[PDB]
Structures are given as C-alpha cells and as structure tokens.
Write an enzyme that holds these catalytic residues in place. Structure first.
Site, mmCIF file in Angstrom:
data_model
loop_
_atom_site.group_PDB
_atom_site.id
_atom_site.type_symbol
_atom_site.label_atom_id
_atom_site.label_comp_id
_atom_site.label_asym_id
_atom_site.label_seq_id
_atom_site.Cartn_x
_atom_site.Cartn_y
_atom_site.Cartn_z
ATOM 1 N N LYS A 159 -21.987 57.054 -30.700
ATOM 2 C CA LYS A 159 -22.192 56.002 -29.726
ATOM 3 C C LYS A 159 -21.085 56.116 -28.651
ATOM 4 O O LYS A 159 -19.929 56.457 -28.916
ATOM 5 C CB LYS A 159 -22.126 54.686 -30.452
ATOM 6 C CG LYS A 159 -22.490 53.502 -29.656
ATOM 7 C CD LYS A 159 -22.435 52.289 -30.616
ATOM 8 C CE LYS A 159 -22.756 50.960 -29.883
ATOM 9 N NZ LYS A 159 -22.854 49.806 -30.868
ATOM 10 N N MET A 204 -22.623 46.222 -24.411
ATOM 11 C CA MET A 204 -22.868 46.247 -25.903
ATOM 12 C C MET A 204 -23.180 44.889 -26.580
ATOM 13 O O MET A 204 -23.413 44.793 -27.805
ATOM 14 C CB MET A 204 -21.703 46.899 -26.625
ATOM 15 C CG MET A 204 -21.452 48.374 -26.225
ATOM 16 S SD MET A 204 -20.586 49.274 -27.571
ATOM 17 C CE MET A 204 -19.039 48.384 -27.684
ATOM 18 N N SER A 252 -26.840 47.434 -30.433
ATOM 19 C CA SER A 252 -26.356 48.231 -29.326
ATOM 20 C C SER A 252 -26.231 49.725 -29.623
ATOM 21 O O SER A 252 -26.044 50.518 -28.690
ATOM 22 C CB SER A 252 -25.007 47.659 -28.830
ATOM 23 O OG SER A 252 -24.125 47.659 -29.902
ATOM 24 N N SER A 253 -26.326 50.158 -30.875
ATOM 25 C CA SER A 253 -26.245 51.611 -31.142
ATOM 26 C C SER A 253 -27.676 52.224 -30.937
ATOM 27 O O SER A 253 -28.159 52.989 -31.771
ATOM 28 C CB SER A 253 -25.747 51.922 -32.554
ATOM 29 O OG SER A 253 -24.650 51.081 -32.944
ATOM 30 N N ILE A 262 -21.291 44.355 -34.573
ATOM 31 C CA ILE A 262 -20.660 43.052 -34.687
ATOM 32 C C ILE A 262 -21.662 41.946 -35.006
ATOM 33 O O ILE A 262 -21.236 40.866 -35.470
ATOM 34 C CB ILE A 262 -19.861 42.674 -33.468
ATOM 35 C CG1 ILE A 262 -18.899 41.479 -33.740
ATOM 36 C CG2 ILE A 262 -20.737 42.395 -32.322
ATOM 37 C CD1 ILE A 262 -17.855 41.359 -32.595
ATOM 38 N N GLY A 263 -22.970 42.212 -34.818
ATOM 39 C CA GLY A 263 -24.035 41.224 -35.101
ATOM 40 C C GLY A 263 -25.352 41.850 -35.586
ATOM 41 O O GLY A 263 -26.407 41.214 -35.508
ATOM 42 N N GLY A 264 -25.302 43.110 -36.019
ATOM 43 C CA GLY A 264 -26.503 43.866 -36.438
ATOM 44 C C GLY A 264 -26.653 45.210 -35.717
ATOM 45 O O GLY A 264 -27.679 45.889 -35.854
ATOM 46 N N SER A 265 -25.650 45.623 -34.964
ATOM 47 C CA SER A 265 -25.837 46.715 -34.056
ATOM 48 C C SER A 265 -25.921 48.130 -34.603
ATOM 49 O O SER A 265 -26.203 49.052 -33.822
ATOM 50 C CB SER A 265 -24.773 46.680 -33.026
ATOM 51 O OG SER A 265 -25.153 45.775 -32.024
HETATM 52 C C1 LIG Z 1 -24.632 44.335 -32.191
HETATM 53 O O1 LIG Z 1 -23.883 44.040 -33.127
HETATM 54 N N1 LIG Z 1 -25.123 43.485 -31.292
HETATM 55 C C2 LIG Z 1 -24.937 42.069 -31.441
HETATM 56 C C3 LIG Z 1 -26.279 41.387 -31.250
HETATM 57 C C4 LIG Z 1 -26.176 39.860 -31.254
HETATM 58 C C5 LIG Z 1 -25.118 39.256 -30.354
HETATM 59 C C6 LIG Z 1 -23.814 39.994 -30.641
HETATM 60 C C7 LIG Z 1 -23.963 41.519 -30.391
#
Ligand SMILES: *C(=O)NC1CCCCC1
Ligand SMILES: C[C@H](C(=O)O)c1ccc2c(c1)[nH]c1ccc(Cl)cc12
Ligand SMILES: C[C@H](C(=O)O)c1ccc2c(c1)[nH]c1ccc(Cl)cc12
Ligand SMILES: *C(=O)NC1CCCCC1
Ligand SMILES: [Cl-]
Lengths: 544, 543
Positions: free
Chosen positions: B110, B159, B185-186, B206-209
C-alpha cells in the site's frame, strides 16, 4: 472548603491503621510464644533466593517465614510509619499457598494503590476513604497463584503525585536511615519497609521516578519495566486515561536477583490469561543470566540537574569498575533533555491543566509535602500563561513547566502524543547509531530532607525521562555518602541557580552514611537485559 | 486556490505513467529472452509452493519477478491499482538474501509504506513531491527476508475511507466487476492481489481497511493487534491519535500466505529495527494446532443488517465448523452501538476533525469521500444543534455527528479510559463463555463505486475490533447467488436511515461476487486467529 469530611476520613483511617498494627502484634506474640527457639535473625537476613529455596525444601515452613517477617515489619514500622494496613485475610492465603509457586511462602508488601479485596486504596485522599476494593488487582492474583503472601499495604504521599511520602490520613513515612530524611516516593512505604529488613519483596509503581526514588533513598534495588510489560488492571490512581507519559509497575527488593525472580514469577501464563491486553512475553532467562561483555552508554550529568558529589562519584566509580571488568563504556546523552522534560513530560502529565487531578482534592487538606503544586495547578490558564511570560527572563525552568501545565484541546494532545512518539524514536536512533546494549546514568541521591521533594521538581530529570521514553530503568545502591562528598555540597550551585537548585542543595546536605545509587537503562521490552546489567553493577560495586 | 493541486495531479500522473512504461519495457525484454517459461503455471502456484521452488533454485527470482511484473501491468489496465513502480527493486532482486523466508517473493505495498525516493501521497497534493528519505521498518524487514517490494498500490484520498479513489491517481476498480468498489483503504492491494497480480501485499487498517478490500476482492487478510508489527515510517493523515489503534498486516490469496508473511516479519530484524514492538516471535505450534475450538458467533451485530449473502456465509461456516467438531456458542460483544458511535467515532475525531482537515486545504475532495469533509468543517455548536434535531428521527446520524465535535484534553483522557474499560468488559464477557475465538459476518458483497463514503454505518462489523484492538482477519467463503441477490429486494435495515438506504442499493447487482466471514481472537493472539482462519478456509473452500 469546610474540612469536616476530611477530618472524619483521617480519624477512621488512623483507627484502622492502629487496629491493623494491634492485630499484627497479637498474631506475632501468639506465634513467638509457640516457637521460642526459632533463629529469627538467621531467617530475616537470608537473601530471598535462599529463603525461597528453604521454603521449597521444607526446611522453613511458610508460617515461620511469615510471622517472623510480620514481627520485623511491626517493629520497623514504629520508627518509619510505613505500614498503612495489615491485609487481614493473609493468614488464610498462607495456608493455601500453592506449593509449586515460584514464590511459595514469600511474604510480599504492596504499595497502597494495588487493589486488595476488602481494603481501601486511599492514596491518602479523603474521598477514597471507606471504599474498599472488591477484588485483588491482577498482579496480586498472580502473586497469590505463585504462592506469595501479600501481607501489608504501604504508605504513599497524598494522591501519589510526589516523590516524598506523607498524606493527611496516615501521616509521614520516614527514611529508616535517618529520620529527618524522606524515604522517597511515591512508593515510599515500600522503600522504608524493604530498606529496613521488614519485607523481602514489594511492588511499587512509577510514572516519573516512584519506584526508583524510594529504592535509591533507602538503599534497595528497584525496577520500573516498560509500561505495558505487566498488567495495570485494578491499580488505583488519581487520573485515568493519560497515556502520553507511561505509568509502570514493578518489584523492589533487597538485591537484583530478587527483582529477577519476581518478574519471572509474574510473567507467567496466569498473568497473560488474566489480562490479555499485556503482550505475552515470558521472562527471558538466558538474557538475564548472560555473561557477555556490554556496550554501556553513560553520562555523569544530564546537564539539567547538577548531580550531587556523591551521585557523580557513584557513577564514575561504577563506570571504572565496569571498564576493568571488560565492558565498553561510551559517552551518551539522550538529545534534547530540556524539551523532553519541560514540554513532553510536564505536558503529558498535566495536558488538562490538572483539572482531573484537582477533583481528587475537593474538600481535602493538601499535605505540606506537595508544596505549592495544588495552588499552582488551580491558577486559570491565562494567569499561568502570563506568569510564565514574566518568569521567563528570570527563571526559565519554572516558566517552561508552568506553561506546560496549562489545559489544552485534544488536537494539541495528539500533537504532544505524536512528539512523544518521535522523541522516543530519536533516542532509539542515537542508541542504535552508537550500537549500545545498555545505558548507565546517575540516579538522584542521597535522600532529600522531608518536605523538600515537592519543592525541588527539576530533580525528577534523571528518572522521568525514562517514563517519557518508556524504557525499562532500574536502580542499584552502589556506595554511601562520605563526609568528603557531603562537605563538597557547599560548592554545589546547580546549573540554573533558581529556587529548585537552591532547595536541592540544602535538601541533599547532612547525608553522610546515606546510600547512593546509579540507574541502569535498556531499550523497550529489554527488562531482562536491564536486570543483567543491574546484576553486574551490584556484583562489581558491592561484591559482599 | 487549486492550481497547486492541479500541478500535483499532473506530476503524479506522469510518475505513474512513466512507472507503468518502465514496467512494460522490462517485461517485454524479459519475455523475449525467455520465450518458453510457463507463465500461467508460475502465476497460479500458491505462495508456499512458489517459495519452495525459489528456495530450491527450481525457479529463479528473475523469472518470478518479471512474470508477476507482467501480470501486475496487465491487471492494472482494468483496475488502476498501481501508483508507482519501486524502481530500484531490480537491484534488490539481485541482492535478495538467499536464506530469507521470502527469498525472491514479489510483494506489493500500500502506498503509505514509505519507500526510499518515492512519495507516499495518500492521494493528497500536499504530499506530492515529498519523497521519502528511507524505507519504513517493515519494508526494510521484507528486503532483509529476501522479498522484493515492487509496486505501490492505490488508496482513497487521505485513507479515511473504505472506497478507493483520489484526485492524483484516480479511481481503483474491483477486478471482479468494474462498477464495484474494490473496498479500501488498502484497495489497490485488494484489486492487485485479487486478480493474480501479486502474491503477497501489506495494508493498514484503522476501521476495516485490510478487511474491506480483502472481502470485496475475494482474498484473505489479517489485521493483527495494533502493536504486533512496526508502524515506524508509515505515512498517515493524522498523527498522535492513539485511542483507536492502527494496525498493519498481510493480504494474500490464502491463509498460509498470511501466516508465512507474519512469521517472516516477526524476526530479530524487526525487533531490533523497532524496539518499541514487543518481541513476540511467531508461535508456530499455536498456528498448526488441530485442537477443537470453542467458537463464539453472531449472524448480525444488530446494527448493520447483513446482506443475505453475508448471513448465508456466516450460517454455512458455522454449520461446517460444528460438523468438524467445534463448539459454536451464540456470542455478541456487549454495547456495540456505544463502541461505534461514541468510542470509535469519538476516538477518530476527538479534535472535531481539525487535524484531518489541514491535509485538505487547497486540495480537491474526491467524490468517494462523500460529505465527510463538508460535515467535519461545520462549527462545533452547529454539529451539536443538528445532532439535537436529528436525534428523534435518526439517532445513528445524530450520535455520530455529536462524536465528531472537538473536545478538550481532559475529555480525551476520559474517552481513552472508557476505551480501555470497554476492552476489559468484552474480554470479561469472552472469558465468561470460555471462547477460544469468535466468528462474525463480514461486510459484503462489494458496494458500488462511490457508495462506501455514504454508508458509514456499514463499518460496524470491522471497526469494533480496532476499538477493542483484537486481531481480526477475513476469509472468502462463498459467492453471491442469484437467490442472495434477489433477496436484497426485501432488505430493510434496522434504522431505515440514509445509511440503510444507500447500503441496500449499493449491495445489489452482485451475483458471482465473493463474500467472506471474519475471524477474531484475543489481543496478541494472531497465531490462533490464523489457525482459526485456516480452518474456515479448509472447510469452506476445500478445492
Ligand atoms: C480503514 O481502516 N478505513 C476506515 C474506514 C472507516 C472510517 C475510518 C477509516
Ligand atoms: C513553582 C512550583 C514550586 O516549585 O513551588 C511548582 C512547579 C511545578 C511543579 C511543582 C511545583 N510540583 C510538581 C510536580 C510534578 C510536576 Cl511534572 C511539576 C511540578
Ligand atoms: C453525513 C455524512 C454522510 O452520511 O455522507 C457522514 C457522516 C459521518 C461520517 C461520514 C459521512 N464518513 C465517515 C467516516 C468515518 C466516520 Cl467515524 C464517520 C463518518
Ligand atoms: C512517582 O512516579 N512520582 C512522580 C514524581 C514526579 C511527577 C509525577 C509523580
Ligand atoms: Cl504494547
């Protein structure tokens, strides 16, 4: 600001302390009557490792170890006022101690903030009085699963934000070496008790030096690990959620091998399953016992706190002995110390201007050992700012601290947290560029007079830096103040000549005969190497 | 004030174009000199057999490298996943340590993993023309293990998104279907690996990326405990935010590849290059264990209604695990809405978004971000008032909005403490059921391009585990059938707010897309998370 609640809290606390002491004494009398032939001084002067071995062989029973140390503690408490509470259920734990525990039969003292079921953790504050814990904290559960017997809570200075040791509930703890001296703090009760032979092993905590000051002031060993090496679950504190400057807990004992044994006992499966948030790093015994020569960074002063003549000698002697034993000694000083202390450390501890911390003092007395801390924190942000501008040309240390004690937004906290993070990397990079294994530094000493630690804040520079950096750091007693070192305090000026230097000068006088330490540092997660180095200093400096 | 931003896009576009030209010229030369190489066979080798042949000399690193380079170039035509070619990699390729666990393995990165002499723009023009002075720690560790990082992959602007578009390199597309997001984001990694362009990639989460793009693109991915791996030299938008834990980890075609990557990274080189990482070596005996597991599971988090494909995937895996001898125990972490709307959101936006917004001064805002930038820009008092207005009708929007207001240091401390007590709370709740692991739905199938940014509620399955900082990974287990797609007509949502509405539409027209489940273990328990993931993979996708 009436004081009736605070007075009633002191009366209750003083009654409970008095009755704990009475129970301890009854239990000791009963025991000594049933066993008048026991060589109690032989038992008390065994090093912990040898105590553990006799316990394990059956040569000493747990009862005899326990009540012999209990009487010793009750006795030394007379002259130190270090014990706040007797942990009443410990006689039951004694009989259920697991025979295979690494600490089977070992009585252990606990700094007052370690929640222990059924007992206050007051932190010397009236608002916590009469509110007992409802469970043992995690490390206490582990100590018990390892067969240890936690037996007393030891005193701390009011709210623990201090390196003295007095509060308005239990009063003042005294250095057992000299009753006009502070035993250090905030783990002062442990230092006083362990340094007089009344406990072979205790646990303290350290957010700016609080394992290391009392260990050094009282002449014992102590280790402050990396903050998240051991569980903090169930520890009482004044403020929660402050993560910029890292709180750690760790052992205090009479020798280095005791610290290693205690860490080894705590770093077991039970801990890691009781608190999965702690990385499950077992004790790396082969690192601890290693005999390889070391690359040892060192400094003789941080250029912030002028070391006492006895501190400077202790450090130079240790360096020389380390040279002669074959270690390579390399000068090294962490970069930007004044920034690390005045901006990052002060800023992280007080990012909210002290509001959370002040809540604990509502309606309470302020112990004189805290000096003017509460008064100054209560000032409105604009007035701190103005006072900081005014003091800047006169007293720049004071001005920098004052400005960093101002509340700020979360946006500025993130910025601080990020600087702490870059600063930690900047020091690791210096360390790796010099290829160090460990770092030897002075340790503040000898013990300061009672009531002066709270008026000598710059003197936390030697210890707090490693809470900021979050590196394991321990202290080992290496010499005692000679009259020659003491007379040389008349020439001590400090680097700044401000009030902190003036107080420190006077507070370190009259210290002939007092123990003096050096500090040993390793990288994050390198507790075993830190200990390996400590063991080497101890062997070299105090062979017998 | 966009002229500088236009210049930055022109320059980045020229760098990406030159990179792709460079890649093609090197590939064509190689193919000419090696006309007989069976290039399909090589590309279809599972990473573990590829490694084996590299280690024995049976395949040369040159052969593997240029074959993947050629495949990466080709799948890039349809996905736009590659932003830059890491030019010096051919020299790395020649010096790659013959003993490394990843000797000769091409690895995509990434874009936020700093690579000496390359921008990590994160799609933002203020980071264009700011090349990095060195490789970040994990990239250094990958080269020391003989791997060959070879491309930077695309990410959504800043991201903070689970779609994948930015104004410098544009939009990345799902390889299975060109109107679908690859996730993010990846997302560049998901698009590239999910189409056979790379055998192993690193992302961040950080949230599912890591988990969104692996799920949307049909590949495996692991988000470890936040401090299991070094974050040193990672580029980011916002620094110093430590309530919600950023984690980095592998993405690959299979579980064993994730395990091999983790085991390569968790070595003395990483522990001494970044001493702030606990030096916990990969525990192989945990990963290879075959003991029956106590597996907690839920079919829904009662916050985001699962698609029919998600629900079926979850039940089917659950049933298989039961038939294989695991104990399946209904279990749902307590107080999910609080964890999302108060802890996660407040943690990510404690400063009201001020620090995030500074990255956008003077820049375009990619459409895939929706109205995020617009909302964060609102005065605090205005956020509060809208929050109060929205609350009786749309409590989800209201709670999120309230949590995106700036607060004081004192309040961040209180938030930080709430996150830590919430974490002890779920851990207590997990141990009271004596769980080994936990199985949950994973969001899917892929949403339509430009909808992730308008369907924030859908982060609920993944971000919960950033808040709790548990290791969590995803495994593709089924594909959407015409029945699963048609049942989307009946999709309601629990709230009927605009996020339920967007999500309902975004998940339609997905027959044939991959769908995953999510596997979770306690902190520091990556090896068990992986063992569990490997089990799910083996039971659900035997061949
Ligand atoms: C990856 O971790 N993206 C996250 C998606 C939800 C908001 C925070 C960023
Ligand atoms: C000026 C005042 C004093 O020295 O009397 C003062 C100033 C700063 C501090 C303090 C007391 N006591 C302290 C304890 C901890 C810290 Cl970080 C700072 C201080
Ligand atoms: C109202 C606006 C929208 O629904 O597009 C909105 C509201 C909240 C968020 C968002 C977009 N995009 C986000 C990304 C992360 C988080 Cl925690 C919150 C949000
Ligand atoms: C214990 O760590 N005592 C510290 C002394 C300096 C300021 C924080 C508290
Ligand atoms: Cl950690």
């Amino acid at each position: 600001t009436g004081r009736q609640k605070a007075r009633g809290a002191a009366t209750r606390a003083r009654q409970k302390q008095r009755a704990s002491l009475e129970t301890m004494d009854k239990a000791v009398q009963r025991f000594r009557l049933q066993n008048p032939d026991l060589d109690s001084e032989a038992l008390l002067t065994l090093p912990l490792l040898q105590l553990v071995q006799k316990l394990q062989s059956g040569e000493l029973s747990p009862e005899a170890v326990f009540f012999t140390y209990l009487g010793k503690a009750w006795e030394v408490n007379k002259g130190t006022n270090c014990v706040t509470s007797y942990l009443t259920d410990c006689e039951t734990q004694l009989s259920q101690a697991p025979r295979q525990g690494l600490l089977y039969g070992v009585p252990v003292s606990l700094k007052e903030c370690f929640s222990y079921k059924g007992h206050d953790s007051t932190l010397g504050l009236s608002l916590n009085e009469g509110m007992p814990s409802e469970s043992d904290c995690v490390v206490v559960q582990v100590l018990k699963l390892q067969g240890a017997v936690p037996f007393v809570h030891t005193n701390v200075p009011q709210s623990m934000l201090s390196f003295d040791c007095s509060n308005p509930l239990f009063g003042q703890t005294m250095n057992p070496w000299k009753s006009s001296k502070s035993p250090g703090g905030s783990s002062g009760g442990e230092g006083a008790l362990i340094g007089s032979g009344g406990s072979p092993l205790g646990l303290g905590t350290d957010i700016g030096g609080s394992i290391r000051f009392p260990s050094a002031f009282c002449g014992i060993c102590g280790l402050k690990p990396t903050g998240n090496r051991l569980s903090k679950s169930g520890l009482k504190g004044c403020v929660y959620g402050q993560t910029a400057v890292q709180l750690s807990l760790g052992p205090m004992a009479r020798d280095v091998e005791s610290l290693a044994l205690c860490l080894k006992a705590l770093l077991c499966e039970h801990l890691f399953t009781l608190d999965p948030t702690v990385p499950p790093l077992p004790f790396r015994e082969e690192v601890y016992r290693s005999s390889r020569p070391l690359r040892v960074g060192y400094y003789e002063t941080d250029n912030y706190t002028m070391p006492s003549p006895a501190m400077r000698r202790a450090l130079i002697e240790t360096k020389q002995r380390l040279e002669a034993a074959g270690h390579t000694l390399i000068p090294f000083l962490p970069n930007n110390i004044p920034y690390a202390l005045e901006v990052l450390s002060a800023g992280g501890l007080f990012s909210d201007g002290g509001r959370s911390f002040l809540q604990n003092f509502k309606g309470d007395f302020v112990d004189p050992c805290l000096g003017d801390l509460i008064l100054i924190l209560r000032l409105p942000s604009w007035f701190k700012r103005l006072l900081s501008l005014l003091l800047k040309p006169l007293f720049p240390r004071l001005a920098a601290f004052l400005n960093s004690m101002r509340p700020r937004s979360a946006e500025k906290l993130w910025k601080l947290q990020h600087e702490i993070e870059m600063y930690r990397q900047s020091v690791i990079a210096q360390w790796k560029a010099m290829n160090l294994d460990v770092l030897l530094t002075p340790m503040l000493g000898p013990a300061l007079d009672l009531n002066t630690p709270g008026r000598a804040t710059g003197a936390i520079s030697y210890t707090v830096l490693y809470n900021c950096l979050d590196f394991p750091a321990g202290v080992v007693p290496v010499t005692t103040v000679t009259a020659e070192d003491d007379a040389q305090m008349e020439l001590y000026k400090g680097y700044f000549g401000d009030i902190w230097d003036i107080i420190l000068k006077k507070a370190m006088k009259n210290s002939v005969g007092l123990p003096v330490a050096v500090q040993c540092v390793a990288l994050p997660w390198q507790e075993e190497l830190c200990l390996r180095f400590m063991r080497e200093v101890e062997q070299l400096m105090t062979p017998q």
